[PDB]
Structures are given as C-alpha cells and as structure tokens.
Amino acid sequence: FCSEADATIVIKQWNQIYNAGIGAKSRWTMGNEIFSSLFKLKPESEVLFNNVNVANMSSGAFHAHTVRVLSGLDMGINYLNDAGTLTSLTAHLAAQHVARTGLKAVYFDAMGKVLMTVLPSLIDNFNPDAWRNCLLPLKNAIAKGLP
Amino acid sequence: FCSEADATIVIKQWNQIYNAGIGAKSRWTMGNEIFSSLFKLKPESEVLFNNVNVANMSSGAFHAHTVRVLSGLDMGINYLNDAGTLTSLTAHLAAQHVARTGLKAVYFDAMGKVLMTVLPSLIDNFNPDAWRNCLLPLKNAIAKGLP
Amino acid sequence: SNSCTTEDRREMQLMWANVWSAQFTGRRLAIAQAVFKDLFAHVPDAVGLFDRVHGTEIDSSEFKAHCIRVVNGLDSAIGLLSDPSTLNEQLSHLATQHQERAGVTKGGFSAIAQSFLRVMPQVASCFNPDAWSRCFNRITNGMTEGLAE
Amino acid sequence: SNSCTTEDRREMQLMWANVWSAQFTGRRLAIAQAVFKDLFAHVPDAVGLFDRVHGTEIDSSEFKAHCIRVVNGLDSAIGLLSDPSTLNEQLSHLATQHQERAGVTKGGFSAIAQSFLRVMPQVASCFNPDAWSRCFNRITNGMTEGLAE
Amino acid sequence: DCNILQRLKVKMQWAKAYGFGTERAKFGNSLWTSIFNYAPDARDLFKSVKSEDMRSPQFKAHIARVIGGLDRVISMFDNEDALNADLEHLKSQHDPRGLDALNFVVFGKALFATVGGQFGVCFDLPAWESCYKVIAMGITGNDMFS
Amino acid sequence: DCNILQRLKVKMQWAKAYGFGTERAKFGNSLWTSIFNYAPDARDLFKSVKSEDMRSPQFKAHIARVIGGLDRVISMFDNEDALNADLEHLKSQHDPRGLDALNFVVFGKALFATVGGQFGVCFDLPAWESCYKVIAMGITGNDMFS
Amino acid sequence: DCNILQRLKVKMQWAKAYGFGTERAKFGNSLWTSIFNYAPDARDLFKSVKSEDMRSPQFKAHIARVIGGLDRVISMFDNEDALNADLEHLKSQHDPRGLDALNFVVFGKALFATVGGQFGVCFDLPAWESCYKVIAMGITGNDMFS
Amino acid sequence: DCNILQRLKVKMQWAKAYGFGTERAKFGNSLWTSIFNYAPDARDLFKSVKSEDMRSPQFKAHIARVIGGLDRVISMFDNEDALNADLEHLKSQHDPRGLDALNFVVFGKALFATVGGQFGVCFDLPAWESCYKVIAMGITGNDMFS
Amino acid sequence: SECGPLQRLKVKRQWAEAYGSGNGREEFGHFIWANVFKVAPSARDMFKRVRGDNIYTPAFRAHATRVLGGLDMCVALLDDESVLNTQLAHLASQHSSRGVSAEQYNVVEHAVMMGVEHEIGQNVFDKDAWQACLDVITSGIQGN
Amino acid sequence: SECGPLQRLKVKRQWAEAYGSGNGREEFGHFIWANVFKVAPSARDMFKRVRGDNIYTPAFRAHATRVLGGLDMCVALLDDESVLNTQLAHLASQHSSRGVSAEQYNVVEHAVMMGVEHEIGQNVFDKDAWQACLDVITSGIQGN
C-alpha cells in the first residue's frame, strides 16, 4: 500500500481533524463539504445518494451517510500499517460499491481530488505527497472492479 | 496549619526577600515599612513599643526589635511543614505577647493586612492565597489568648 | 481548614479540563444548561432573575449565549486559581456584574454550588467533590463580597 | 510502488548533503559540468538548447553560471521534498522556465536522469540509486508537466 | 436513561480507551476475545468473517468495522436525527441475520469490561449500561433493552 | 447464579485488584468515590462515619472496614457454611439501619468499575455480577438480588 | 579582632552552611548534638525546653530560636548599633539563668565544627573564633571572651 | 585516472577519516603500524626519526609531518598548478634518500586500509587507488605508478 | 478570503492550541496587548479603569483574561451562526459607549493574529482563515 | 568597510550556518520577509503573482526559496569575481522590469542581515563583513 513513514504522517494528520473525541457536527460539516464538492465535479453522481436523502443534506439520513463514509475512510487510514487487513477491508468496501448501479471508477478519481483539495484547508502542514502515496492505493482498492 | 504545597510556595517566596545572605539594612527597611504601616492602621499600638525606642525608628534599639520580629516570622515560615514544632514555637510567641499589656488581637489582624499589603511590593509573583492559607493560622496561633 | 489549597487547585483544573471542550460549545452548553435546570428546579424564584436572557426558555439562543458566558467566566476563574493576584481582580469584576440586581444573593450561589455538585459527577471522570467545592466556594466568595445574604 | 517515500526523501537529502558544498562552488560546479558533459555526449542535439549560455564552452563563465543555477534549483527541490506543498509550487515555476523552448522535452529529462545516475556514484559516498531515482523522477515529474514527450 | 450528560461522559471515556492507530485494533481484539469467552457459542455466528482465526485479516477486518461502528454511533450521541438514522441502517443489516438478542447483552458486558479495564477506575459503568441500551435498542428493536 | 468456577475467577481477580499495603487504601477510596459520584444522596447515609470529609480518619476507618468485609467474604466464597454465617452477621449489622436495597445495586456497580479498572481488560463482568448478587442477597435479604 | 572583612566572611559562610527550610533544623540538631556530646552536663540546663528528648517539639522549638538568634545577630554584624542593642537584649534574657560562661565556650566549639563540617575546607576558623567572641561577649559580658 | 569527481570523493572521505585533534595522531599511528607490519624492512629506513620507538616524540613528529603532507596534497587535488609544485617539492626531499619505489606501493596499501577502516563500507577504493597513483607519481616519478 | 465551514474548523483547533488550558494564557494575553499598545500607544487612554498604563498589573491582566475569554466564546461559536450573533451583539453593547474605531479593531485583530502565530508557530498558522474569521467577529462587535 | 578576501570567507561560512542544509530554511526565509514587509508594507504590491499579501502560502514560500537560493549562489561565488558578475547580471535582468528602488534593496539587505544574525546569534555576527559584501551583491543586481 504505502510506506510506514508515509502512513505514519497520514495517520497523524488525520487524527488531528478526525478522532473519537470530535462531535459529529464537525464530522458531517466535513462530510457535507466533501460531497458538495463531489457533486460540483461530477453532478451525475448526486442521483446515486437518493436513498439517503441527498435532496436535504441537513437531514439525519444524509448526515449519517457521510458519517459512515468518513468512518470507513478513517478505518482504512488507521490500518495502513496492516496491509493484509487493509486488503480485506478494502475488498469489502469494493463489494459495497460494485453492487451499486451507476458508479464509475472516475467518480472515485473525482473524490480523490476533492480530498486533496479540502484536507489542506483543515490540516496543519498537509503533506500532499504522503497522502497521495497512501490514498491512491486506497482509492483504487475500493474502486477495484468499478466501471 | 497549611498544606505542604502552599507552605512550599510561602517558604520560597520568603527566602527570596529574606535569608541569611541579606544585610541587616534591608532587614530593618522592611521592618520599618511594616511597623510604620501598622501605626497608620492602629496608632494606639505605637505606645507599646516605647521600651525599644519607637520614638526614633532609626535607633539601634528599634532596628534590633524589627530584626527579631522578622526573624521570628521567618522561623515560623520555615517550620510550616513541622506542625508539631510550629505549635510549640507559636505557643512561645503567644506567651511573649499575652504578657504584654495593651495588646489586642485586632492589632495582629492589622499586622496581617500590613503583611498582605507590603509583601507583594517586594515578592515576585506574590501568591496571596497561599500566604493567607499559611499566615492566618500563624497569626491566630500567636494571637491565641489575646484580648 | 476547608481552604482551597494548591493541591485542591490542581485537582479542580484537572476535573475541569477533562470535561471542558476547547473548540465546541456542545459540552459547555450542556453542562451550563444542566446546572441552571437544577438551580431552577430547586430555586423556583431564580428563573425571574434571568428574564433578560430568557431563563424560562433554556433552549433559546439568548439563554444559550448566557450559559456560555457563565461557563466562560467560571473557566477563567478556575484557570486564574494559579495566579491569585489576577484572580482577585477578576472576581471583583464578576461581583459588580452580579451587584445592583435584586434577588441575586449569597443564597443563590450556595444553591448553584449544589447544582454543580450534582451535574459535575455525571459528566466528569474521577470527580473529587471535596476538593471541588473548597475551591468553588473560594471562587464564589470573591463573587459575593458586596451581596446580601 | 516506485513512489518517492518519506524514507527515500531522507536518503536523497543525505546523498546530496554529503556531496554539496555550502560555501564554495568548486563541488557544485564539478558535479553540474560533469552531468551536462554526460548529457551532451549522450544527447548531441541538446547542446544547441543552451546556445544562450555557451553550452559548447562548458568552461566559460556563462555556462559555469548556468550550471550553478541548475544545481541550485535541484538543491532547492531536494530540500523542499520535506515540504511538498511548497515543493509543488516551486516545481511549477521551474516548469514554465523550461516551457516555451523547442527541443526541451520529457526525453531530455530522462537522459539527464541517467546523467546523474552515472555522475553521482563517482562523487557521493553510500549512494543509493534506487532511492535516488524514485525521488529524482518525482521532481522531474513536476518540472515536465506541460512539456512534449 | 442515557441523558445528555451521560452521553458526553460516554463519549469522553470512549475516546480515551479507544485511542489511536494500532491500539484501536488491540482494543477491538480484546473486546471480541471477551465476547467469545463470555459466550463460546457466539463464535460460530461469524464464520462468514473467519472467526475460526481471530488473527486472520478477515476477522481483523470484521473487528475494525464493528468498533468503527461503535465509534461513529457514539460520536452521534448528541444528535438524535443522525443517531437514529444510522441505528436504523445498522438494524437493516443485522435483522436478516436472525440474531438472538441475548448476544447483544453479551456484547455490552464485553464492551464495559474492555473500556473500563482500559480507562481505569473512573469508568462510569451506570452511564455505559444506560447508553449502550440506547444503541442495542436501535439495532435490535428488542424491549429487553428498554 | 455464581457457580464454583465463577467464584474462583472472582477470588483471583479480587486478590489482584486489591493489592498490598497502601494500595488497599487507594483502592478503597476509589470505590467510595465512585459510590458517592454514582449516588450523591447515599453520602448522607454515612454521617455516622463522617462522610462530609472523605480523608478524615473516621471515614478512612469505615473504608477499611468495608473493603475488609469484601475481602473476607470473597475469601470464603468456596465454603458455604462460613460464607453464609458471615453474610448473616453482616445482615444483622445492616438491617436495623433501614437501608434502601437499591443502594446495594449502586455499590455493586462501583465495585465492578473499581476492580475492573484496576485489574484490566480481562475482568469477568458477568462473573462479578452473578457473584456480587450472592453477597447482596446475603446482606439485604432482598429478592432483588435473587 | 573580628574586623569588617571577617564579619563579611562569617556572614558568607554562615548563610551557605545554614541553608533553607528543613536543612536549617538539621544544622541546628547537629549543633546541639555536638554541645551535649562536648559537655553532657549542659543537657540538664535545658529541662525547661525538654532536652530530655531532642526530637520533641519543645526542644526543636528551642533549637529554632537559638539558631534564629545566631542568624539575626550575624546578619547585624555590619551595624554596631543594632548589633549591640540585640546583644544587650540577649544578655538580659540569659543573665537571670546564672549560666557558667564556660558553656558559651563549648557552644562556640560546637558551632565551628558544625558550620565548618557543613561548609567544607574553606571554612575560616580564625575569623569564626574572633567574631564568635564578639557575640559571646555581648551576651555574657565575660572577659574570658576578650 | 583520478578525474575531478574522484578527486572530490577522495577529499570528502579523507576529511572524514582524518578528523580533528588527537584522532589525527591515532590515524597516523595506525597508518604507520600498518606500513611496518606490511613491510618490516621499511622500519630501518626511519632511524633518523627514531622508528625504533613509534611512541617517541621523534617518530610521532615524523608521523605528523607525513599525514600533514597527505592532507595538504589532497587539499590541492583540484588545482594542478599548486599540486604539481608541491609534489615537485616533495620529490626534491625524497630523491636524495634513494628510496625503493616499492615502498610507496606499500604506503598506498596501508593508507587505503586505514582510511577505509576508519571511514566505513562506503570507502571508494578504486578512486583512492587512482588518486594515490597521482601522488606517488609526483613524489617518485616512477612509471610503476602510471 | 471567506470564513466558510472549513476555515471555521481550522481556526477553532488553532485557537484551542494557542489559548490552551490556562498555563500559557497570561503570556498569551501579554504578547497580544504589548503589540496593540506598541502599534497604537494612543489606545491606552480608553483603558484607564483597568491600568492601561501598566499591562503588568493584576488589574490589566484580568482585563486581558476577559478579552481572551470573549474571543474564546466567539471562536467556539463560529459553527453556530444563531448563538454567535447573540454573543457578538452582547460584545457590541459592551463597547457601544467607548468610541472604538474600525482602525483599532484591526490593530487588535493583527495583534491577536501575531499572538496565535507566535503561540503555534508560523509553520502552521493559517493567515487567510484567521483574517476572514476574525473579520466576521470584529464586524459583529461593531454592529456592522 | 570593504568586502575583501577575508570578509568574503567569513560571510561564506556564516551564511552556510544560517542557510543550513534545508530544515530551517522555511523559518529562515519567513523571518526575512516578515521583516521586509513590516519595514516596508508598500513593497507587497510588487509580489502580487506570488501572494505577497500572505507570506504563509506555499506560493510565497516558494518565492522566498528562490530568493534565498539566489543569495546562496552569490555568496558561494564571492570568491569567483568573473562567475559572480555573470550571475549578478542574470539576477539584474530578473528584476529589470520591476522598478525596484535602491531604498528597497537596502530594506531586504537589512532583513537578510537581521535574519542571519537571528540564525547564528548576535555573539558572532560580523556586521561590517556582511554589510560590505551584500552591498557588492545588491549593487550588481541593480546594474550598478
């Protein structure tokens, strides 16, 4: 996936803005910013989130969706040094996405650029290279098998 | 009397302005300021120091009086962590004062306010709470039995 | 002695920091609102002292902003317990802010002191009620100097 | 992965600092001139890209000053590998400096990359070619964004 | 029960005992070692994630998802709308498995022991009993958690 | 229920959380700090031992008596005759004080959090719940603890 | 003797060997352990302050007053007026006790040994012999200290 | 051989292994311990500087001059004019001694072993073989060093 | 730049680091107001009651404590538009009769920014986020 | 004072210490340009393309990297008159169309000097050597 020193940087900068001691309001604030930006790069994808009430991004259903997305992203980040477990974790995330009709791999490319865009606004001394070396293997492993 | 951490603060701030390596001129300067202030709050008490030539506060007799007062105050401060010995030391100081005619306990209250007033002008980061927690048990133990 | 000692001061700042939220009012607002709920349910005539900040509507923006101010003033005082010189000045400022208000007395502070004694163990870990109240009283003592009983 | 890792970055800065001279161009000038000698002897038509700085006369003051500039720009980039945010900006500035010049392509950088791979072990102690080229390529990747193949 | 103060208390003590990085996996391994020791029969329920070997990347992956689920649910303790929505989502995943609700009771005991054994003496067990009921109630719907 | 194997586990985990010397005093202070934080009103029940000041010699003597009672009861967990004789004796000391049996529920919660927070992650909470019931039943006689 | 230089020297070495806080009491205990070892008969003179037990708060209090007296007198070494005035005050307290002046000689020996053993090799014994004479002369008035 | 890159490389590794202060003398003693161990016959050539005792100030002085000579020559590796001029100066000092050139080969082996054993694995032996040839050629003039 | 949701989050965390728990608060406040009065000595007169002449006094240190507490309340409320506006209006009334210029609010603004940077380091300080979100705060203390 | 052979050697070694290998370079450049823009805020406008408004941005930090690299090349060439003049002329053309005043070159000069002193300590800083040898550099960037 990515090196231990790179993974160490990513994990530390991530806990900085995301951990168990952070109220969910900042959780879905980040989630709303991330997904609103995804719908601006790829408007065609907003229809895929109709089941979680994307029509109202202030709803309890969509807040919960973004929370479990960021939680899954957090789970992958915190297992960067356990490559065997990360493989299984990303394989499961891939199955949870391949089954969803309308998802193209390009949408995950667009999500990657959103993360590379938003996170520097949130993170002290954001390291885009350490994040690229680690997120891109994550992105592909989740988009593995996507059209 | 007072807690060990409070006593530690008092003792340290006291050695700062009073120790064995300090010439007696600064000793009676502090003593003159302290007693001049006591005579301004309670003028009735200046008559009690006639035996040590309070009429001339530049005299060798009155300099010596203030020196032994501050020395006794120093002795009590440096035994704050030895409560059993401080009890005996203050009991002796009480006997040396109860025997003196004309002394009211209110005079020792006034002395306390003088100390709380003067010492901040002399001491770096004077801690009035740590000093109150320790001096007030000292003051009462010396004024114990006074009218 | 019942005096707020250097030890008691360290412990209170620990009990407070392990609950205080440095970035979001969610934890401060909850503690404060819970305290005044306790105070009002024990002192009914106190709600009318906060007519101005909508005391009857604890979830209004006006009372939310007042709760934040109260908790901010307590936070400043707890931190200034390390610097009693400055603390004494700040407690005087708080006193005159609670002065010239009929109904604001020394009896209401004893009541809110109990309010905190019931709220804090529900949200604070490793709570020491003895060391807490000795320094809480030390704080309120400066806040109630020129107040009625 | 072939990615320039945090580890590879530390190693390159070590390979570079153990050769770089902080006070005298003698070591910088030698490395740079040796690199372009290698590049010209492998890419003959490249010399004409440096007509302006007397590429044919490697020992002229004009090409000496150009070599110092190239090595200074590489030194800045290697140091900025620790701060990729700033690094990305600096590599863009270098890209536009190599843009709008016919003959300056992505093929010349692959050639000079080999030039460095032959020069550096001759002057650097403890040289790691794997870790060096992974981050050298990372650097040239930003320098060749809007260039022809 | 599980008032707003207990919800904050639970969020505090959870964040501490849960920690960062690989300690998270150690917590999760301890949580599940306790569940299978409290109820050895529950292990056969997780053959789809290779509970046959709790060191396998399959079961380690399951542990991560579960404790990640606890974390996100606890993080939403202060927002009813997002909380219930996610609890409904967890219920829709667990209902087709036809799980005996008595194992969610077992899960709670193992969670209390793991958090409290990691957090120390100041563990607020009543608050965790109350606020776990809210979680198990949302996932199962069983009034055993009333 | 509290069977013989659970009795052995509790004896073993108690011995270890309890400790030697001044650790017992620190253990005892934490248990009673937890009790009065779990239920502030229960503190007024102990004015006979000066609960107003918990570092007073009168209350520290009470703490020592209580955790001394816990230790000796737990030690006799494997002899029914001796154990029930002592529980009967403890019941006779507590009954004329008219105590609400719900306070013994709170006591158990604090005991679990104290022992568990001291002993660590492998604390057997089901074992302790079932066996403390045996103690609380022996002392109060209330079928709450049945 | 005891010129102004020796008075400053004595003030320096006294401040160092006397120290701060509880070390002061250790110095004082050593000073008096030496006096009673040099002259065991002198111990019976201090039954009013419980010299029967040098660890008692009564004798510890006496030690503090005495070494505090030394400190204030040494501190006034550079001001004749204040010095003699305080020495007269000490004389008025010691005269009614009818003390053999040979014990003030013993006190001096014990003081030199304690200060020098605490201060180290650079102890100026002649200066301390000269300037202690000035002190004992003011308290006793005996020309043995001439 | 001995191009400009190898000259810089040699200057780098020399500066490191040569060090500062007394380590310089330890390097020099090791260099000459090796020469006399590689060729015991060479020792008799240095009776003018008391090679009979390598610890004597006479031979220590000789060691210092030699390694100081290496250092200044290596320092001038990047300037042909100064280099050859100093090498000619060394040649005029060594020629009247009628030295077998095979001992300059021995000197080189001992120098490589000492520098490399001090500098570590990254020692560039080919570069040191090439650039020492340049030095021995300038001092001896022998085409054995071609 | 704009004080959007992301900038409010960054400012929140950076303030919490700079403001801290309470130990460095006295030095934090001192650094700020030593800067304010250096850039604008004429501002001292408005602080007559709190010893603006001597910022080392306990009287002024308590004033600096109140100012920082006011900033803390606003920063903590940057994600709560409704409540933030209420508190900002309270601060506005606390300054209404004092004639504080828009130039002076910018001076203190710059001092607060130099103080946070001095507290957390230039290496991480987000000038755009801090400038935009303090503008939102000061502009609300000035009514508008 | 004159920038002779000895002063060039001293400046060389003192620069190498201050400029370092690369770890303190971001702080080194920041200290310099925080001084420049404080002494002369009006100079910010010439740096519009590199975010002169916000010297914390990666855009300006890259500009400060280039400036320091330019100084490094000149300092390293202070013992090489011919090559130094060539590089100084290159810097001159890089500033030719920008209208940089002689007053501004002295401002940056003073900032560079305060930055080296801040980096190596006032205890060793050679003001005469640095003043004389930076004059030689700036005067060559201004044509003459």
Ligand code: HEM
């Ligand atoms: C780092 C990037 C992403 C991660 C870690 C991630 C992870 C997740 C997770 C954990 C879930 C919920 C699974 C569950 O129901 O338990 C989810 C749902 C979903 N994700 Fe992703 N996701 C990512 C990016 C994307 C992208 C780029 C898309 C493109 C449209 C996408 C589309 C969806 C959809 C449609 C759902 C289902 C929403 C629903 O429940 O109705 N995700 N994702």
Ligand code: HEM
């Ligand atoms: C911290 C406060 C005080 C301390 C430690 C203290 C201690 C002493 C000491 C050690 C002496 C000399 C005893 C001796 O003769 O050996 C003394 C004398 C005396 N003190 Fe106090 N004192 C204090 C405050 C006061 C106050 C407030 C008064 C009120 C008038 C007072 C009245 C006197 C008098 C009248 C004498 C006798 C003066 C004389 O010798 O003629 N003292 N005190």
Ligand code: HEM
């Ligand atoms: C530790 C306890 C308390 C603290 C730290 C505290 C602090 C504060 C603070 C900081 C303010 C804001 C003043 C302003 O912004 O001008 C305030 C206002 C006020 N407080 Fe307190 N307070 C405490 C207890 C009480 C009690 C017990 C009462 C009444 C029984 C009370 C009554 C009031 C009133 C009436 C106001 C003004 C209403 C308003 O500003 O709209 N406070 N308090």
Ligand code: HEM
């Ligand atoms: C790591 C590799 C390289 C680095 C660090 C580098 C860096 C630089 C720098 C700093 C300059 C100075 C620009 C200025 O002062 O305005 C420059 C100029 C130039 N470079 Fe590169 N360069 C590299 C590779 C190449 C290659 C491979 C080529 C061609 C195949 C090339 C062609 C040029 C040209 C034509 C100029 C301008 C001529 C002149 O300024 O007189 N560079 N380079």
Ligand code: HEM
């Ligand atoms: C608070 C308690 C619990 C939480 C938060 C929780 C959460 C989760 C999560 C997040 C997943 C992964 C969903 C997915 O991505 O597909 C999952 C799967 C599962 N859970 Fe739960 N869980 C809890 C308790 C339990 C209990 C007590 C049982 C059974 C005794 C159970 C049985 C399962 C099974 C069988 C699976 C799927 C295994 C597989 O994928 O093969 N869960 N749970």
Ligand code: HEM
């Ligand atoms: C659950 C296990 C408990 C044990 C092993 C235990 C043990 C003891 C012991 C050994 C004594 C001393 C008896 C004596 O010598 O006079 C005592 C006294 C007492 N206990 Fe308990 N206790 C338990 C629970 C409780 C609870 C939950 C309460 C009330 C909430 C309680 C209330 C009291 C009171 C009021 C006293 C009398 C204190 C006094 O002497 O003034 N006990 N207990």
Ligand code: HEM
């Ligand atoms: C430089 C030498 C000495 C100094 C500075 C000194 C000082 C003092 C002081 C300050 C007191 C306490 C006065 C009071 O507060 O009542 C005292 C008491 C006393 N001193 Fe001295 N002393 C010295 C030597 C001696 C010697 C050598 C003896 C006897 C051999 C002696 C016998 C006593 C006695 C018997 C008391 C009173 C004991 C009591 O209160 O019951 N002193 N002295």
Ligand code: HEM
């Ligand atoms: C790179 C190799 C060498 C260098 C740089 C070198 C350098 C020097 C230097 C600096 C001196 C001192 C000249 C003076 O101040 O009088 C010296 C003296 C001498 N060297 Fe060499 N040397 C080298 C190799 C050798 C070898 C291989 C031999 C013989 C096998 C040799 C034989 C001598 C002798 C006999 C003396 C004079 C001893 C005396 O003064 O009594 N040298 N050399």
Ligand code: HEM
């Ligand atoms: C920009 C953010 C500011 C904040 C957060 C702030 C906060 C505060 C607070 C909380 C008080 C206490 C009011 C009270 O308790 O009565 C206060 C008082 C005061 N402030 Fe500000 N303030 C700010 C800006 C300014 C500026 C820019 C000035 C003047 C240049 C200023 C001048 C004053 C004055 C004169 C007082 C009255 C102090 C007294 O005499 O008691 N404030 N401020």
Ligand code: HEM
């Ligand atoms: C005194 C020593 C100086 C050095 C070593 C230096 C160095 C440099 C360098 C290397 C560049 C990069 C040019 C490029 O790549 O296109 C640059 C750009 C620039 N410099 Fe300087 N400079 C100095 C003085 C100054 C001064 C005093 C000013 C103004 C007060 C100034 C204003 C500028 C401007 C406006 C740019 C253009 C930046 C851009 O928009 O890309 N320079 N400088």
Ligand SMILES: *[C@@H]1O[C@H](CO[C@@H]2O[C@@H](C)[C@@H](O)[C@@H](O)[C@@H]2O)[C@@H](O)[C@H](O)[C@H]1NC(C)=O
């Ligand atoms: C969007 O939702 C906002 C938030 O309200 C919460 O979520 C909605 C879905 C309801 O469940 C409500 O009870 C919650 O409090 C609303 O403020 C907003 O009006 C909604 N927008 C529209 C267009 O309906």
Ligand SMILES: *[C@@H]1O[C@H](CO[C@@H]2O[C@@H](C)[C@@H](O)[C@@H](O)[C@@H]2O)[C@@H](O)[C@H](O)[C@H]1NC(C)=O
């Ligand atoms: C008060 O005393 C001042 C200090 O003089 C010293 O003390 C007096 C008591 C004499 O002992 C003298 O020999 C000392 O040098 C005098 O300067 C001052 O004049 C005195 N004041 C009065 C009114 O007599």
